[PDB]
Amino acid sequence: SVSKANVPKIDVSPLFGDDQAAKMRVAQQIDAASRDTGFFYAVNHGINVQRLSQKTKEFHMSITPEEKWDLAIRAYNKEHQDQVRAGYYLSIPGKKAVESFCYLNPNFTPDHPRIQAKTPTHEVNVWPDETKHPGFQDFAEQYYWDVFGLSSALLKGYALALGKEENFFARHFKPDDTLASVVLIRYPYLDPYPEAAIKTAADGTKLSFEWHEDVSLITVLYQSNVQNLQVETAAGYQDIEADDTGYLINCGSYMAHLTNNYYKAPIHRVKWVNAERQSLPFFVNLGYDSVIDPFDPREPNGKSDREPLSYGDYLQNGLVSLINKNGQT
Ligand SMILES: CC(C)[C@@H](NC(=O)[C@H](CS)NC(=O)CCC[C@H](N)C(=O)O)C(=O)O
Ligand SMILES: [Fe+3]
């Protein structure tokens, strides 16, 4: 049968401090995980994930069909042509079980020059009515900055792991322009569960979401305590154990590009499980014009012939491709 992936628990707390050797020891653990299955759990991360789960559940479980249409992305509501990324992603009973709510940088307002210029991938977030959902927007925006702070620290770990100065990635990850997103995903319990919402992998495994590489620099994921993720290895898919106290971390394909695939973007998929649960990714994206010069840590001179890829073009191309390959979520 199906083996279990080695997903080490890494105490990331030194990355918030000034003990440089302790940070190097974290970096070594990140390097090792990134060169093996590509996943690790960040522990001692400083975020109240219990409050995150509770507030998210309160939102998912209290929003009405009317509110969902009013917040829907353009894939579900033609009136909302400016909502490609941010908003509500509806379930379709009998056909599509998952639903979700995506939001972007709270600093994208009508005053922001990327909104004024109508640059692709930048949108103003949409929110439900505050009195129907008291505290939800406050919680969600606070959470964005809490996970931004964790992610910055993790990026310092990744930079050190690759032999760079600690700000090599983080200097491009800024509150004024980050394209990072939070998605609050509900995977429901359904009885009967409609087979139309279940995909069958080549290997026979029943899936809710097919294999993919993440469109991100890194991905910083909370999930409730229901095992579902699998990572591809040469010997087949391996189960990633759940941990509802930590953050599951992995690289996306922008990291693979800039490291000449030294830190691969691990291919992974979501098993079908008939259980009520949450999947709350934070996709760590840079700014639209951010460019990291590629390098090859395998080569003595570190030189890579790969082209510098602008983050915004990478993101626009990647989000569209992922919809085409794995379906509109
Ligand atoms: C694997 C999990 C992270 C999750 N899947 C996902 O979140 C999948 C694959 S990483 N991600 C996406 O569809 C991209 C959403 C991007 C977001 N709307 C945005 O505009 O930035 C799941 O639980 O299905
Ligand atoms: Fe993913």
Side-chain angles (χ1 to χ4, degrees), residues 48-50 52-54 56 58-77 79-106:
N48 184 347
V49 297
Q50 290 75 35
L52 168 65
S53 176
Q54 194 154 54
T56 296
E58 291 174 11
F59 168 76
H60 280 148
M61 300 309 272
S62 73
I63 189 175
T64 62
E66 179 175 25
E67 295 181 293
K68 289 179 193 177
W69 291 125
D70 284 348
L71 296 175
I73 60 168
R74 80 178 177 183
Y76 301 96
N77 185 339
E79 303 181 17
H80 295 169
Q81 289 303 304
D82 296 332
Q83 297 184 233
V84 183
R85 302 178 68 196
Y88 214 88
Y89 292 55
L90 282 72
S91 71
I92 308 176
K95 300 294 187 191
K96 174 179 179 282
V98 70
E99 58 188 276
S100 61
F101 174 77
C102 175
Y103 60 102
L104 306 184
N105 191 331

Short mmCIF file of all heavy atoms in Angstrom, two decimals, residues 48-106, unseen atoms left out:
data_model
loop_
_atom_site.label_atom_id
_atom_site.label_comp_id
_atom_site.label_asym_id
_atom_site.label_seq_id
_atom_site.Cartn_x
_atom_site.Cartn_y
_atom_site.Cartn_z
N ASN A 48 -2.19 32.09 16.79
CA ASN A 48 -3.32 31.42 17.43
C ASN A 48 -4.14 30.75 16.33
O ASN A 48 -5.09 31.31 15.80
CB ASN A 48 -4.15 32.41 18.24
CG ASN A 48 -5.27 31.72 19.00
OD1 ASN A 48 -5.58 30.56 18.73
ND2 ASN A 48 -5.90 32.44 19.93
N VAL A 49 -3.75 29.52 15.99
CA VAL A 49 -4.48 28.81 14.95
C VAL A 49 -5.84 28.32 15.43
O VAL A 49 -6.73 28.07 14.61
CB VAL A 49 -3.65 27.67 14.33
CG1 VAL A 49 -2.42 28.20 13.64
CG2 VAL A 49 -3.29 26.65 15.38
N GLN A 50 -6.03 28.15 16.75
CA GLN A 50 -7.36 27.81 17.25
C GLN A 50 -8.35 28.92 16.95
O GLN A 50 -9.46 28.65 16.47
CB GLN A 50 -7.32 27.52 18.76
CG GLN A 50 -6.60 26.23 19.13
CD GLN A 50 -5.10 26.37 19.03
OE1 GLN A 50 -4.55 27.43 19.32
NE2 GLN A 50 -4.43 25.30 18.62
N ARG A 51 -7.99 30.18 17.24
CA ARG A 51 -8.88 31.28 16.90
C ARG A 51 -9.12 31.35 15.39
O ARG A 51 -10.24 31.56 14.93
CB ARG A 51 -8.30 32.60 17.43
N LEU A 52 -8.07 31.11 14.60
CA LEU A 52 -8.22 31.08 13.15
C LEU A 52 -9.29 30.08 12.73
O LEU A 52 -10.16 30.38 11.90
CB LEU A 52 -6.87 30.69 12.52
CG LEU A 52 -6.88 30.32 11.02
CD1 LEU A 52 -7.27 31.55 10.19
CD2 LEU A 52 -5.54 29.75 10.59
N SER A 53 -9.20 28.86 13.26
CA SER A 53 -10.14 27.82 12.89
C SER A 53 -11.54 28.17 13.34
O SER A 53 -12.50 27.99 12.59
CB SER A 53 -9.70 26.49 13.52
OG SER A 53 -10.65 25.47 13.26
N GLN A 54 -11.67 28.70 14.56
CA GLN A 54 -12.99 29.00 15.11
C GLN A 54 -13.67 30.11 14.32
O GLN A 54 -14.85 30.00 13.97
CB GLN A 54 -12.88 29.39 16.57
CG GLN A 54 -14.20 29.39 17.28
CD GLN A 54 -14.03 29.15 18.75
OE1 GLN A 54 -13.27 29.85 19.40
NE2 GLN A 54 -14.69 28.12 19.27
N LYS A 55 -12.94 31.20 14.04
CA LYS A 55 -13.54 32.31 13.31
C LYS A 55 -13.87 31.91 11.88
O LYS A 55 -14.91 32.32 11.35
CB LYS A 55 -12.57 33.50 13.31
CG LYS A 55 -12.26 34.06 14.69
CD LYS A 55 -13.49 34.58 15.39
N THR A 56 -13.00 31.11 11.25
CA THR A 56 -13.29 30.63 9.91
C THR A 56 -14.54 29.75 9.90
O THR A 56 -15.39 29.87 9.02
CB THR A 56 -12.10 29.85 9.35
OG1 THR A 56 -10.97 30.72 9.20
CG2 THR A 56 -12.42 29.23 7.98
N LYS A 57 -14.67 28.86 10.88
CA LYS A 57 -15.85 28.01 10.93
C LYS A 57 -17.11 28.85 11.11
O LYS A 57 -18.13 28.61 10.45
CB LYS A 57 -15.73 27.00 12.06
CG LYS A 57 -16.77 25.88 11.96
CD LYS A 57 -16.52 24.76 12.95
N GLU A 58 -17.05 29.86 11.98
CA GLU A 58 -18.21 30.71 12.20
C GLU A 58 -18.66 31.38 10.90
O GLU A 58 -19.86 31.52 10.64
CB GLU A 58 -17.90 31.75 13.27
CG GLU A 58 -17.75 31.17 14.66
CD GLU A 58 -17.30 32.19 15.69
OE1 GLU A 58 -17.31 33.41 15.37
OE2 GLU A 58 -16.95 31.78 16.82
N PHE A 59 -17.69 31.82 10.09
CA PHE A 59 -17.99 32.43 8.80
C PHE A 59 -18.58 31.41 7.83
O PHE A 59 -19.69 31.60 7.31
CB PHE A 59 -16.70 33.05 8.25
CG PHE A 59 -16.76 33.48 6.81
CD1 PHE A 59 -17.43 34.63 6.43
CD2 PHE A 59 -16.11 32.74 5.83
CE1 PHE A 59 -17.47 35.03 5.11
CE2 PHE A 59 -16.15 33.13 4.51
CZ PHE A 59 -16.83 34.28 4.15
N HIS A 60 -17.87 30.31 7.59
CA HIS A 60 -18.36 29.31 6.64
C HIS A 60 -19.76 28.82 7.01
O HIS A 60 -20.54 28.49 6.12
CB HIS A 60 -17.43 28.09 6.63
CG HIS A 60 -16.19 28.27 5.81
ND1 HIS A 60 -15.00 27.66 6.15
CD2 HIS A 60 -15.94 28.94 4.66
CE1 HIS A 60 -14.08 27.97 5.26
NE2 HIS A 60 -14.62 28.75 4.35
N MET A 61 -20.06 28.71 8.30
CA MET A 61 -21.29 28.06 8.73
C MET A 61 -22.45 29.03 8.89
O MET A 61 -23.58 28.58 9.13
CB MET A 61 -21.05 27.28 10.03
CG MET A 61 -19.98 26.18 9.90
SD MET A 61 -20.23 25.05 8.51
CE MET A 61 -21.28 23.87 9.33
N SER A 62 -22.22 30.34 8.72
CA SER A 62 -23.27 31.34 8.86
C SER A 62 -23.59 32.12 7.58
O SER A 62 -24.59 32.84 7.56
CB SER A 62 -22.95 32.32 10.01
OG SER A 62 -21.90 33.22 9.67
N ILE A 63 -22.81 31.96 6.50
CA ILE A 63 -23.02 32.73 5.28
C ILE A 63 -24.13 32.09 4.45
O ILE A 63 -24.18 30.87 4.28
CB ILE A 63 -21.72 32.92 4.48
CG1 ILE A 63 -21.94 33.93 3.33
CG2 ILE A 63 -21.22 31.59 3.93
CD1 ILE A 63 -20.68 34.26 2.56
N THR A 64 -25.05 32.93 3.92
CA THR A 64 -26.23 32.45 3.22
C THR A 64 -26.02 32.44 1.72
O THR A 64 -25.11 33.10 1.20
CB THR A 64 -27.43 33.35 3.53
OG1 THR A 64 -27.16 34.68 3.06
CG2 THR A 64 -27.70 33.41 5.03
N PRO A 65 -26.86 31.71 0.97
CA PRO A 65 -26.76 31.74 -0.50
C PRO A 65 -26.79 33.15 -1.06
O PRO A 65 -26.06 33.46 -2.02
CB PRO A 65 -28.00 30.94 -0.95
CG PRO A 65 -28.30 30.04 0.19
CD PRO A 65 -27.94 30.80 1.43
N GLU A 66 -27.62 34.02 -0.50
CA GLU A 66 -27.69 35.39 -0.99
C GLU A 66 -26.34 36.08 -0.85
O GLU A 66 -25.85 36.74 -1.78
CB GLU A 66 -28.77 36.14 -0.21
CG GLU A 66 -28.90 37.57 -0.61
CD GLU A 66 -30.05 38.26 0.09
OE1 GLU A 66 -30.44 37.82 1.20
OE2 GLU A 66 -30.57 39.24 -0.48
N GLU A 67 -25.73 35.96 0.33
CA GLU A 67 -24.43 36.56 0.55
C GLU A 67 -23.37 35.96 -0.36
O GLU A 67 -22.46 36.67 -0.80
CB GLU A 67 -24.04 36.38 2.01
CG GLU A 67 -24.95 37.13 2.98
CD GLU A 67 -24.49 36.93 4.41
OE1 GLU A 67 -24.58 35.80 4.90
OE2 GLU A 67 -24.04 37.91 5.03
N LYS A 68 -23.45 34.66 -0.65
CA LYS A 68 -22.48 34.04 -1.53
C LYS A 68 -22.55 34.62 -2.95
O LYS A 68 -21.52 34.93 -3.54
CB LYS A 68 -22.66 32.53 -1.56
CG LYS A 68 -22.24 31.85 -0.26
CD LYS A 68 -22.47 30.35 -0.32
CE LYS A 68 -22.36 29.72 1.06
NZ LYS A 68 -22.66 28.25 1.00
N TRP A 69 -23.76 34.78 -3.51
CA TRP A 69 -23.86 35.42 -4.81
C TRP A 69 -23.29 36.83 -4.77
O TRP A 69 -22.59 37.26 -5.70
CB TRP A 69 -25.31 35.49 -5.31
CG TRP A 69 -25.95 34.18 -5.70
CD1 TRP A 69 -27.11 33.69 -5.20
CD2 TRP A 69 -25.48 33.22 -6.65
NE1 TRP A 69 -27.42 32.49 -5.79
CE2 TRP A 69 -26.42 32.17 -6.67
CE3 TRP A 69 -24.36 33.14 -7.49
CZ2 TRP A 69 -26.29 31.07 -7.51
CZ3 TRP A 69 -24.26 32.03 -8.34
CH2 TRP A 69 -25.21 31.02 -8.31
N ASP A 70 -23.56 37.56 -3.68
CA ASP A 70 -23.13 38.95 -3.60
C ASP A 70 -21.62 39.08 -3.52
O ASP A 70 -21.08 40.12 -3.91
CB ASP A 70 -23.79 39.60 -2.39
CG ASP A 70 -25.28 39.93 -2.64
OD1 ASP A 70 -25.75 39.87 -3.79
OD2 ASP A 70 -25.99 40.27 -1.67
N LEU A 71 -20.93 38.06 -3.04
CA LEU A 71 -19.48 38.07 -2.92
C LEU A 71 -18.78 37.24 -3.99
O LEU A 71 -17.55 37.17 -3.98
CB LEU A 71 -19.07 37.52 -1.54
CG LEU A 71 -19.48 38.29 -0.29
CD1 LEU A 71 -19.05 37.47 0.93
CD2 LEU A 71 -18.83 39.66 -0.30
N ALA A 72 -19.54 36.62 -4.89
CA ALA A 72 -19.00 35.60 -5.78
C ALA A 72 -17.97 36.17 -6.76
O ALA A 72 -18.12 37.28 -7.29
CB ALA A 72 -20.15 34.98 -6.58
N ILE A 73 -16.93 35.37 -7.04
CA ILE A 73 -16.00 35.72 -8.10
C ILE A 73 -16.71 35.62 -9.45
O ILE A 73 -17.81 35.05 -9.57
CB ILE A 73 -14.74 34.85 -8.07
CG1 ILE A 73 -15.14 33.38 -8.26
CG2 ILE A 73 -14.00 35.06 -6.78
CD1 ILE A 73 -13.97 32.48 -8.53
N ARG A 74 -16.06 36.13 -10.49
CA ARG A 74 -16.72 36.20 -11.79
C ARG A 74 -17.01 34.84 -12.40
O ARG A 74 -17.92 34.72 -13.23
CB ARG A 74 -15.91 37.11 -12.71
CG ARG A 74 -14.75 36.50 -13.35
CD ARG A 74 -14.13 37.55 -14.26
NE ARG A 74 -12.91 37.08 -14.89
CZ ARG A 74 -12.16 37.83 -15.68
NH1 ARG A 74 -12.51 39.09 -15.92
NH2 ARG A 74 -11.05 37.33 -16.21
N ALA A 75 -16.31 33.79 -11.96
CA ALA A 75 -16.61 32.45 -12.45
C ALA A 75 -18.02 32.03 -12.06
O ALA A 75 -18.59 31.15 -12.71
CB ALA A 75 -15.56 31.44 -11.96
N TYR A 76 -18.57 32.61 -11.01
CA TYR A 76 -19.92 32.28 -10.56
C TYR A 76 -20.91 33.42 -10.75
O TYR A 76 -22.12 33.17 -10.65
CB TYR A 76 -19.91 31.83 -9.09
CG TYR A 76 -19.05 30.63 -8.86
CD1 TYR A 76 -17.73 30.75 -8.42
CD2 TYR A 76 -19.54 29.36 -9.09
CE1 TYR A 76 -16.95 29.63 -8.23
CE2 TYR A 76 -18.75 28.24 -8.91
CZ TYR A 76 -17.46 28.38 -8.48
OH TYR A 76 -16.70 27.25 -8.31
N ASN A 77 -20.45 34.63 -11.04
CA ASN A 77 -21.33 35.79 -11.12
C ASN A 77 -20.76 36.75 -12.15
O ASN A 77 -19.78 37.45 -11.89
CB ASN A 77 -21.44 36.46 -9.75
CG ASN A 77 -22.43 37.59 -9.72
OD1 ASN A 77 -22.74 38.15 -10.76
ND2 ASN A 77 -22.95 37.92 -8.54
N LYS A 78 -21.39 36.78 -13.32
CA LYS A 78 -20.96 37.62 -14.44
C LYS A 78 -20.98 39.10 -14.10
O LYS A 78 -20.31 39.88 -14.80
CB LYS A 78 -21.85 37.35 -15.65
CG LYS A 78 -21.71 35.96 -16.23
N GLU A 79 -21.72 39.52 -13.08
CA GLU A 79 -21.74 40.93 -12.73
C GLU A 79 -20.43 41.39 -12.13
O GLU A 79 -20.20 42.59 -12.05
CB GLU A 79 -22.88 41.24 -11.75
CG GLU A 79 -24.28 40.84 -12.21
CD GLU A 79 -25.38 41.21 -11.18
OE1 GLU A 79 -25.13 42.05 -10.28
OE2 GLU A 79 -26.52 40.68 -11.29
N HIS A 80 -19.57 40.46 -11.72
CA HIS A 80 -18.39 40.79 -10.93
C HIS A 80 -17.12 40.60 -11.74
O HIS A 80 -16.21 39.86 -11.33
CB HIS A 80 -18.39 39.92 -9.67
CG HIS A 80 -19.54 40.20 -8.75
ND1 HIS A 80 -19.84 39.39 -7.68
CD2 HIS A 80 -20.42 41.23 -8.69
CE1 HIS A 80 -20.88 39.88 -7.03
NE2 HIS A 80 -21.25 41.00 -7.63
N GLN A 81 -16.99 41.31 -12.87
CA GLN A 81 -15.86 41.06 -13.77
C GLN A 81 -14.51 41.45 -13.16
O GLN A 81 -13.49 40.96 -13.64
CB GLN A 81 -16.04 41.79 -15.10
CG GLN A 81 -17.14 41.21 -16.00
CD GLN A 81 -16.90 39.74 -16.32
OE1 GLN A 81 -15.85 39.36 -16.83
NE2 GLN A 81 -17.88 38.89 -15.99
N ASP A 82 -14.49 42.28 -12.13
CA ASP A 82 -13.21 42.62 -11.51
C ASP A 82 -12.74 41.60 -10.49
O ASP A 82 -11.62 41.74 -9.98
CB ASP A 82 -13.29 43.98 -10.79
CG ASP A 82 -13.54 45.14 -11.73
OD1 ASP A 82 -13.16 45.06 -12.93
OD2 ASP A 82 -14.13 46.14 -11.27
N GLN A 83 -13.56 40.60 -10.14
CA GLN A 83 -13.22 39.60 -9.14
C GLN A 83 -12.75 38.34 -9.85
O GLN A 83 -13.53 37.42 -10.12
CB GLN A 83 -14.42 39.27 -8.26
CG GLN A 83 -14.91 40.45 -7.45
CD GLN A 83 -16.03 40.07 -6.53
OE1 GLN A 83 -17.09 40.69 -6.53
NE2 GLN A 83 -15.81 39.04 -5.72
N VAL A 84 -11.46 38.28 -10.15
CA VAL A 84 -10.85 37.07 -10.66
C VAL A 84 -10.31 36.21 -9.52
O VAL A 84 -10.45 34.99 -9.54
CB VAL A 84 -9.74 37.47 -11.66
CG1 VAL A 84 -9.11 36.29 -12.29
CG2 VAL A 84 -10.31 38.35 -12.75
N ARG A 85 -9.73 36.85 -8.51
CA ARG A 85 -9.11 36.16 -7.38
C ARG A 85 -9.93 36.27 -6.10
O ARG A 85 -10.15 35.26 -5.43
CB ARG A 85 -7.70 36.73 -7.10
CG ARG A 85 -6.71 36.66 -8.27
CD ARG A 85 -5.36 37.29 -7.92
NE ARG A 85 -4.65 36.49 -6.91
CZ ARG A 85 -3.61 36.92 -6.21
NH1 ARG A 85 -3.16 38.15 -6.39
NH2 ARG A 85 -3.03 36.12 -5.32
N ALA A 86 -10.34 37.47 -5.71
CA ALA A 86 -10.88 37.69 -4.38
C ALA A 86 -12.39 37.54 -4.39
O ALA A 86 -13.08 38.09 -5.27
CB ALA A 86 -10.48 39.08 -3.88
N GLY A 87 -12.90 36.81 -3.41
CA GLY A 87 -14.32 36.64 -3.23
C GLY A 87 -14.68 35.21 -2.91
O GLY A 87 -13.83 34.39 -2.51
N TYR A 88 -15.96 34.91 -3.11
CA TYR A 88 -16.51 33.62 -2.75
C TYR A 88 -16.52 32.68 -3.95
O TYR A 88 -16.87 33.07 -5.07
CB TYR A 88 -17.92 33.73 -2.14
CG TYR A 88 -18.11 32.66 -1.09
CD1 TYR A 88 -17.74 32.89 0.21
CD2 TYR A 88 -18.61 31.40 -1.42
CE1 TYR A 88 -17.86 31.92 1.18
CE2 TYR A 88 -18.74 30.42 -0.45
CZ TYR A 88 -18.35 30.69 0.84
OH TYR A 88 -18.45 29.76 1.85
N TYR A 89 -16.16 31.42 -3.68
CA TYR A 89 -16.06 30.37 -4.68
C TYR A 89 -17.12 29.37 -4.26
O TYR A 89 -16.97 28.67 -3.25
CB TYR A 89 -14.68 29.71 -4.67
CG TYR A 89 -13.52 30.56 -5.13
CD1 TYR A 89 -13.24 31.79 -4.56
CD2 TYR A 89 -12.64 30.09 -6.10
CE1 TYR A 89 -12.13 32.54 -4.97
CE2 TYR A 89 -11.56 30.83 -6.52
CZ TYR A 89 -11.31 32.06 -5.96
OH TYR A 89 -10.21 32.74 -6.42
N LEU A 90 -18.22 29.31 -4.98
CA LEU A 90 -19.40 28.59 -4.50
C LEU A 90 -19.27 27.08 -4.69
O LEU A 90 -18.66 26.60 -5.64
CB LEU A 90 -20.67 29.08 -5.23
CG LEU A 90 -21.25 30.41 -4.74
CD1 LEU A 90 -20.38 31.58 -5.16
CD2 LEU A 90 -22.64 30.58 -5.30
N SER A 91 -19.87 26.34 -3.77
CA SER A 91 -20.12 24.94 -4.01
C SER A 91 -21.28 24.81 -5.00
O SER A 91 -22.05 25.75 -5.25
CB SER A 91 -20.48 24.24 -2.71
OG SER A 91 -21.77 24.64 -2.29
N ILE A 92 -21.41 23.62 -5.56
CA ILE A 92 -22.52 23.32 -6.45
C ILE A 92 -23.10 22.00 -5.94
O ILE A 92 -22.55 20.92 -6.23
CB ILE A 92 -22.05 23.19 -7.91
CG1 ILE A 92 -21.25 24.40 -8.35
CG2 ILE A 92 -23.27 22.98 -8.83
CD1 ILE A 92 -20.69 24.28 -9.76
N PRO A 93 -24.17 22.02 -5.15
CA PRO A 93 -24.65 20.77 -4.56
C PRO A 93 -24.92 19.73 -5.63
O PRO A 93 -25.52 20.02 -6.66
CB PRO A 93 -25.92 21.20 -3.83
CG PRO A 93 -25.66 22.62 -3.47
CD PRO A 93 -24.91 23.19 -4.65
N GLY A 94 -24.47 18.51 -5.35
CA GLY A 94 -24.56 17.41 -6.29
C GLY A 94 -23.39 17.30 -7.24
O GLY A 94 -23.28 16.27 -7.93
N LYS A 95 -22.54 18.30 -7.32
CA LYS A 95 -21.48 18.37 -8.32
C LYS A 95 -20.14 18.77 -7.75
O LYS A 95 -19.12 18.21 -8.16
CB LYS A 95 -21.85 19.39 -9.42
CG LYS A 95 -23.13 19.08 -10.17
CD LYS A 95 -23.05 17.82 -10.99
CE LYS A 95 -24.31 17.63 -11.86
NZ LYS A 95 -24.35 16.30 -12.46
N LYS A 96 -20.10 19.77 -6.87
CA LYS A 96 -18.87 20.34 -6.38
C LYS A 96 -19.04 20.57 -4.90
O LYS A 96 -19.92 21.34 -4.48
CB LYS A 96 -18.53 21.64 -7.11
CG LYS A 96 -17.31 22.40 -6.54
CD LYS A 96 -17.07 23.65 -7.36
CE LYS A 96 -15.90 24.45 -6.86
NZ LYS A 96 -16.23 25.25 -5.67
N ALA A 97 -18.25 19.88 -4.09
CA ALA A 97 -18.40 19.96 -2.65
C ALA A 97 -17.68 21.16 -2.05
O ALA A 97 -18.22 21.79 -1.14
CB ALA A 97 -17.86 18.68 -2.01
N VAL A 98 -16.48 21.46 -2.52
CA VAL A 98 -15.66 22.47 -1.88
C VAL A 98 -16.25 23.86 -2.12
O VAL A 98 -16.84 24.16 -3.15
CB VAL A 98 -14.23 22.35 -2.43
CG1 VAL A 98 -14.13 22.77 -3.89
CG2 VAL A 98 -13.24 23.11 -1.57
N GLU A 99 -16.05 24.72 -1.14
CA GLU A 99 -16.31 26.13 -1.33
C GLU A 99 -15.22 26.87 -0.59
O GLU A 99 -14.51 26.30 0.24
CB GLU A 99 -17.69 26.52 -0.85
CG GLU A 99 -17.96 26.22 0.60
CD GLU A 99 -19.40 26.44 0.98
OE1 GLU A 99 -19.76 27.60 1.27
OE2 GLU A 99 -20.19 25.47 0.97
N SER A 100 -15.06 28.13 -0.93
CA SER A 100 -13.99 28.88 -0.31
C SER A 100 -14.20 30.38 -0.45
O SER A 100 -15.02 30.86 -1.23
CB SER A 100 -12.65 28.48 -0.91
OG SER A 100 -12.62 28.77 -2.29
N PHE A 101 -13.40 31.12 0.31
CA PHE A 101 -13.39 32.58 0.27
C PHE A 101 -11.94 33.02 0.23
O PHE A 101 -11.15 32.67 1.11
CB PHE A 101 -14.07 33.17 1.50
CG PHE A 101 -13.98 34.68 1.62
CD1 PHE A 101 -14.80 35.50 0.85
CD2 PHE A 101 -13.13 35.26 2.53
CE1 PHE A 101 -14.73 36.87 0.98
CE2 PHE A 101 -13.08 36.63 2.66
CZ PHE A 101 -13.88 37.43 1.88
N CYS A 102 -11.57 33.77 -0.80
CA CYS A 102 -10.21 34.25 -1.00
C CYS A 102 -10.14 35.75 -0.79
O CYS A 102 -11.01 36.50 -1.25
CB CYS A 102 -9.76 33.93 -2.41
SG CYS A 102 -8.13 34.57 -2.86
N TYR A 103 -9.08 36.19 -0.11
CA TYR A 103 -8.81 37.60 0.02
C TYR A 103 -7.31 37.86 -0.12
O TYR A 103 -6.48 36.98 0.08
CB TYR A 103 -9.40 38.22 1.30
CG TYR A 103 -8.90 37.66 2.62
CD1 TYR A 103 -7.95 38.34 3.38
CD2 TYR A 103 -9.39 36.46 3.12
CE1 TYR A 103 -7.51 37.85 4.59
CE2 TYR A 103 -8.98 35.96 4.33
CZ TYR A 103 -8.01 36.65 5.07
OH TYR A 103 -7.61 36.18 6.28
N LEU A 104 -7.02 39.08 -0.54
CA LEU A 104 -5.70 39.55 -0.91
C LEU A 104 -5.22 40.58 0.11
O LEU A 104 -5.87 40.83 1.13
CB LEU A 104 -5.75 40.19 -2.30
CG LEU A 104 -6.33 39.30 -3.40
CD1 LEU A 104 -6.24 39.98 -4.74
CD2 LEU A 104 -5.63 37.96 -3.46
N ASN A 105 -4.09 41.21 -0.22
CA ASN A 105 -3.50 42.27 0.57
C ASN A 105 -4.55 43.31 0.96
O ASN A 105 -5.13 43.97 0.06
CB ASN A 105 -2.41 42.91 -0.29
CG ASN A 105 -1.51 43.85 0.47
OD1 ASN A 105 -1.93 44.46 1.46
ND2 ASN A 105 -0.28 44.00 -0.01
N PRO A 106 -4.84 43.49 2.25
CA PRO A 106 -5.78 44.56 2.65
C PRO A 106 -5.34 45.96 2.25
O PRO A 106 -6.18 46.87 2.27
CB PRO A 106 -5.84 44.42 4.18
CG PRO A 106 -5.50 42.97 4.41
CD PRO A 106 -4.45 42.65 3.39
#
